[PDB]
Design a protein around this ligand. Sequence first.
Ligand SMILES: CCN1C[C@H](C)n2c(c(O)c3c(=O)n(Cc4ccc(F)c(Cl)c4)nc(C(=O)NC)c32)C1=O
Ligand SMILES: CCN1C[C@H](C)n2c(c(O)c3c(=O)n(Cc4ccc(F)c(Cl)c4)nc(C(=O)NC)c32)C1=O
Ligand SMILES: [Mg+2]
Ligand SMILES: [Mg+2]
Ligand SMILES: [Mg+2]
Ligand SMILES: [Mg+2]
Ligand SMILES: [Mg+2]
Ligand SMILES: [Mg+2]
Ligand SMILES: [N+]
Ligand SMILES: [N+]
Ligand SMILES: [Zn+2]
Ligand SMILES: [Zn+2]
Lengths: 184, 184, 368, 368
Amino acid sequence: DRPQKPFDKFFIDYIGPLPPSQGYLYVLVVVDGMTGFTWLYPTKAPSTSATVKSLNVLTSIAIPKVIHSDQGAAFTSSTFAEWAKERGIHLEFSTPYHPQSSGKVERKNSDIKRLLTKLLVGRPTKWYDLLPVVQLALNNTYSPVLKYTPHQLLFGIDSNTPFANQDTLDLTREEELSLLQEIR
Amino acid sequence: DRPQKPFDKFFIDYIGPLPPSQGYLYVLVVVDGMTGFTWLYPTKAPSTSATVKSLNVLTSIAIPKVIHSDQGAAFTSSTFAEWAKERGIHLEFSTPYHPQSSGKVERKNSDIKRLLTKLLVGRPTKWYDLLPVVQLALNNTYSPVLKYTPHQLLFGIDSNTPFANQDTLDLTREEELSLLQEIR
Amino acid sequence: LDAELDQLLQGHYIKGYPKQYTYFLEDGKVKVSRPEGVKIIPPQSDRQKIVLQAHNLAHTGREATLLKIANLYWWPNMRKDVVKQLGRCQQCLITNASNKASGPILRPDRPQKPFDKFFIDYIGPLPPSQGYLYVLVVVDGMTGFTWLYPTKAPSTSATVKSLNVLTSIAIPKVIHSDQGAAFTSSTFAEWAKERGIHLEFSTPYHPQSSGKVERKNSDIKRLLTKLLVGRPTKWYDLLPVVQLALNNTYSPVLKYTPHQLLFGIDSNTPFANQDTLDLTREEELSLLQEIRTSLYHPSTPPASSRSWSPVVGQLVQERVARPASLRPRWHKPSTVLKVLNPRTVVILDHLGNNRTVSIDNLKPTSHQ
Amino acid sequence: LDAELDQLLQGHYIKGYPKQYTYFLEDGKVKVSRPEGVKIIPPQSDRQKIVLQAHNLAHTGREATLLKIANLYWWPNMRKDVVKQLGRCQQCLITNASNKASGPILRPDRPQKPFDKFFIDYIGPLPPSQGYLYVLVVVDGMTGFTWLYPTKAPSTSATVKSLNVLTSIAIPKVIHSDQGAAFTSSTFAEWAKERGIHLEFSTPYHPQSSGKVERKNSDIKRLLTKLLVGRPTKWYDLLPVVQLALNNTYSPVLKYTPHQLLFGIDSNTPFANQDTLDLTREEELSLLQEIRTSLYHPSTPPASSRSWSPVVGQLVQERVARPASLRPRWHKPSTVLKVLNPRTVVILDHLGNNRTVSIDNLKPTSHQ
DNA sequence: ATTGTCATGGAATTTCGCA
DNA sequence: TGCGAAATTCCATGACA
DNA sequence: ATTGTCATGGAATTTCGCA
DNA sequence: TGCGAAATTCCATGACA
Ligand SMILES: CCN1C[C@H](C)n2c(c(O)c3c(=O)n(Cc4ccc(F)c(Cl)c4)nc(C(=O)NC)c32)C1=O
Ligand SMILES: CCN1C[C@H](C)n2c(c(O)c3c(=O)n(Cc4ccc(F)c(Cl)c4)nc(C(=O)NC)c32)C1=O
Ligand SMILES: [Mg+2]
Ligand SMILES: [Mg+2]
Ligand SMILES: [Mg+2]
Ligand SMILES: [Mg+2]
Ligand SMILES: [Mg+2]
Ligand SMILES: [Mg+2]
Ligand SMILES: [N+]
Ligand SMILES: [N+]
Ligand SMILES: [Zn+2]
Ligand SMILES: [Zn+2]
């Protein structure tokens, strides 16, 4: 078996509904398997159409050999299958109710959710503008298991935005009580 | 005394009134002394203004050392004198009632009058358009006294319109009887 | 194809497939072990489609198409197959730039006499002055002597009016012009024929051909500019001054002014040359004829190292004159009928018309 | 003057007036008998006015001004007096063309790393497509990897929106651009400062300076053209395809694609290179660092025989950027303050501002 | 305070296949 | 140890408003 | 069936003035 | 038969939409 590489497998999934931001409600999350690199796309819905429109942007930069998802409707549609086939992408689904990625991807997806939650409290509506900085953070976050960030693994260089301040990522006592009050 | 040259002396004079042609009534006649070359300019009047406007065209091509005329009002005006002085042209007048040029100029001026008269009968009103061809004729007409046409003397070459048909220049019996009827 | 590749698998030698390499089967595909790695040998019947796919990714030329192909495949003489497709891609042929220079310019003989040949052209639109917008420029080929005429439009009617005033002085044998509408109209042709003048047109969109008058245009604008510095651009009243100014300016290479070359003596203008004061007009015209024939003539410069030269039957492409945004800069290929001279050709254009064209508006079609 | 000319008439020797010629009086004017004929020697106090009159006939340069003067006059060192006036004629200095080439171009070092330096520029206006009219082009200096963004205008706001999407991937140290309004606005400066990006501007009207992105513009238009042959120019939907197509095209001199230089491995695109299949990512990134440093670098070409080079304190003139009809093509003279490099200078402009300018938009003022 | 670039296809040169 | 041809490299040309 | 040109000012080369 | 400097010639550069 040949060693794992960038673009071998992209792991994709939706997050939301979220509080509306510039009319967007969901985030399409794409994580490269080997590097742990994350791309984020704001959508208006978890539809095949929004997925195709988003991935058309990503795949005009790099095309994965395999896309992996759970069995969301948007990913199991025959439209999404026609799209993947046109582009020579093999689609891969985890069995229903039982999502599998890899340790790396599972952890990264955990961070994304946790990092989003942290920033949407206080400004639940400004997350659209924050997407770029969330991505830089995620992508310049050191990997305990490998010695490198996703950036370094994808490009083979240090980044110009090193995030030396590995943050709490936990909710402070303020953020806890005013998050239980935002949905109350 | 140095030999005579083109541009040494231009002899100028007016012809008219004539039957209106494109609203013109007179012809300013300019003959180079040495070559016998003729330039013609249609004017609306024998004024200093029309003279200046016409000679401004000629003198944007070549400037005479001396202009010679009779004592016409247009030529004796102080405006015409200012014009000549500005341009370094010495003005020369023949004594009143007694016009002198040279044999060459006298003959050329005779031809011009005779050639005009011939062409204006039958079409007394189309002479404006005919000016160009009149000039070519005059300027490519052989000089009995010198072996050369004015063209040859001015440019030092044969012309592309040689007028081999030295015409009658006289009025035919038709032209005589219908010229006495045109002013009747 | 599947034929050739069979013989090859059972150790037989086929021409173009070097015997020293081991050719094997794997995943149902003939493979070979090349220094650079293991490549697939597609069957001949597959090869055209592969080249085309590689090429069409970005419509790449020889080497960049090849590099893509060599990633997966090997077969004998791939570049020959690559070049074959490049020569058949209409979009590449009509869009790509040339990389071959024209041959060195011709320096045609100076017309022998004043009035042998006039060169004419319009300058403009200029800023309005007295309601005029253009200048008709007329340059005698032998002397450089120039006539200027303000017009409201670059029209036949305005050209005819101006030339009627000019031809009052003398009739030229030939008038040379570019193919602007004013000069190509049948009205203007009638006017020329009426007076025995032969009209001679530049190849289209090649103002070098009217170089004599084009070069005078520059001096005309240059002098107009200097005179108008710090004033509004009221140029109409200046034309006469410019005409006279230029006709009496020395050309340092010739040591004569266009007025001198035309008349053999200065008129009453400033700093008039006095050298022939003691000659008779006849002696003067004699020296003049001599001056006119001994004028400096430039010769054709060295060719560039990568110039090309038109050959009868060759495929060549005409430059699109006024290409629209995102549209090809070259017409479809056409055929050289006659080579009029090393810098001028007649082509048959696919429509197919005869067109007389400057080599500067042609490139040779690549890849034959 | 009348002083010098007196001594000269009574046979005394004055310096600059060769003793071997006979100097006499006639018509109240000092004359000399020169090989070419008899010329007038004007008094020194007259000479400036003579030169000026000769010069102003047509604003002629050295030799053509001289030839007019030599028609009537002689005095010692006329050309020195001629040149003195040419150097003082504002209209000549600002209107005439240069006849000196710039020194040979610099070939700046390739940025060492992806994201060290971005080059950016607008293309357009193009024909409307989906109501878009422009393209923002962003080119990484090290890799050549390119990003394309359709905009309705070449505006700061559209640039900021596009760069926000791009900088999601990575932040560059420097962004280099020409001085178009979109890039010079304080809004855009704020945006750059906010993110630690240093803005670096080309000298004005010198797109060679943004050559990296300018050159990519060409390929972008070239590919768009080929794809649109025989169809209406609906280019918006093509931008993504073009981006991907170009980022994966080999540069024949480098033997790499911009994608390869950025990632060290092809993604799932056609004819993907498979050479590093058995290396680990770490081995792959190791070979990549090596490739990145060993890339071909062009060197500065030979200077032309008549190039000039800027020197501190020299009078030079800036090219007018968008000269109006019949207006000078050059600004008034100015002074070289600093020589930043042989091709770039700071000048003080008479207003007097400091301006950083390309030598290609300068000529040295003639005649000192 | 900043600075030309690089796809292209014939030609020139080098390497390959075989002896 | 050298041949003929294929492969690769060289590099002027031209276009980026 | 047609085709580059030529003012410009530093540099290069030639000629001049004198011996 | 030769020197230093002035004169002339040479010629690349660039602009004619
Ligand atoms: C419509 C008929 N027509 C065809 C074209 C438009 N054209 C006409 C002109 O008079 C000129 C002109 O003067 N120049 C300026 C120029 C440029 C480079 C040179 F070497 C030289 Cl000697 C002159 N260019 C063009 C032209 O071809 N531009 C692309 C031109 C013309 O009348
Ligand atoms: C207004 C700010 N501004 C200034 C000028 C207008 N500019 C700007 C551009 O992007 C370009 C441009 O792409 N090209 C094309 C070109 C021409 C020759 C070359 F060598 C290369 Cl490398 C590119 N030309 C110009 C220009 O300077 N024309 C006279 C230009 C720009 O944005
Ligand atoms: Mg899901
Ligand atoms: Mg009278
Ligand atoms: Mg024209
Ligand atoms: Mg023109
Ligand atoms: Mg720009
Ligand atoms: Mg640009
Ligand atoms: N010729
Ligand atoms: N550099
Ligand atoms: Zn193609
Ligand atoms: Zn001047």
